[PDB]
């Protein structure tokens, strides 16, 4: 269709990976041609209507695969960024039809996409995060495979000691998934929370992805509040027995839990929690104590304490109160 033909031509043109190690002038020329070709199509697919036809889909997916599905160790990032931006605009288009795209965006594609999450470039991981989040939401028949494959990446790292650079981004995607769970939480999701999310707190590199991890845990509790006890107890279990600045994170996570905790569930764990909180106030590390003392500023926590002061106050101030 003339313009469809040119679109496909330019897409395929961006599948030629060149290098002139003996001609810097020709190399920059080719790079710019490719950069311009991508830029044109980015603008073209973004602002034009009804340009994504059925024959376009395999060309876009192939162009992405040829360019992105590479081996890791980039320097030629302005090229990769354009491919990411184009493919995202492709996925996000109002004319995008998953029923057509599901043929080319499959499990092998998703799996290869996930392998890129181990990239050391934060910019790339960010694009992959947005991309996979889009793919997950658009393709129902991949959600199960995606969940399991993310599960596998997590079941590694923790146990298999297979370090991963994209744990944060993946958890951020998961947080988006958890927030939209169906009313009775499937057992598979409960199993995941208790057997994967919680043990993630014991890993040494927790600092890198802790805010994302905490959000997932909190979101899990805003869904089914009955999961409060095994979470808090595990968090108290994975709590640093050595007084360390790492405690502030747990205190951040714990207060964020208390902000969404139900009173009936608060009672179940208020004693071991505040026994730990009391230790934090007594901490040799000022940062830890300062963070723990900030709990009293929370009005909802105060509500829970004031209506349970008979058992909590003797724990926080044993010299001033008794049972």
């Amino acid at each position: 269709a003339d313009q469809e033909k040119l679109f496909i031509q330019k897409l395929r043109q961006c599948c030629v990976l060149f290098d002139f190690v003996s001609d810097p002038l020709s190399d920059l020329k080719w790079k710019e041609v490719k950069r311009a070709a991508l830029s044109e199509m980015v603008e073209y697919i973004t602002h034009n209507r009804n340009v994504i036809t059925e024959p376009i889909y395999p060309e876009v997916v192939h162009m992405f695969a040829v360019n992105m599905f590479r081996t890791l160790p980039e320097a030629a990032w302005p090229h990769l960024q354009l491919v990411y931006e184009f493919f995202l605009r492709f996925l996000e288009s109002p004319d995008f039809q998953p029923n057509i795209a599901k043929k080319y965006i499959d499990q092998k594609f998703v799996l290869q996409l996930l392998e890129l999450f181990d990239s050391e470039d934060p910019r790339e991981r960010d694009f992959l995060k947005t991309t996979l989040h889009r793919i997950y939401g658009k393709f129902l028949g991949l959600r199960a495979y995606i969940r399991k494959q993310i599960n596998n990446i997590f079941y590694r790292f923790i146990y298999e000691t297979e370090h991963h650079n994209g744990i944060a981004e993946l958890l951020e995607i998961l947080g988006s998934i958890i927030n939209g769970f169906a009313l009775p939480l499937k057992e598979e999701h409960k199993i995941f929370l208790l057997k994967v999310l919680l043990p993630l707190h014991k890993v040494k590199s927790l600092s890198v992805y802790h805010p994302q991890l905490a959000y997932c845990v909190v979101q899990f509790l805003e869904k089914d509040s009955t999961l409060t006890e095994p979470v808090v107890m595990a968090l108290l279990k994975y709590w640093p027995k050595t007084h360390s600045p790492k405690e502030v994170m747990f205190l951040n996570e714990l207060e964020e839990i208390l902000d969404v905790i139900e009173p009936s569930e608060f009672v179940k764990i208020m004693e071991p929690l505040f026994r730990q909180l009391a230790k934090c106030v007594s901490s040799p590390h000022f940062q830890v104590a300062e963070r723990a003392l900030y709990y009293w500023n929370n009005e909802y926590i105060m509500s829970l304490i004031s209506d349970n002061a008979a058992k909590i106050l003797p724990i926080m101030f044993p010299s001033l109160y008794r049972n």
Partner: peptide, 8 residues
């Protein structure tokens, strides 16, 4: 922040 994804 990523937009929520309703489960099916």
């Amino acid at each position: 922040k990523l937009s929520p994804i309703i489960e099916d």
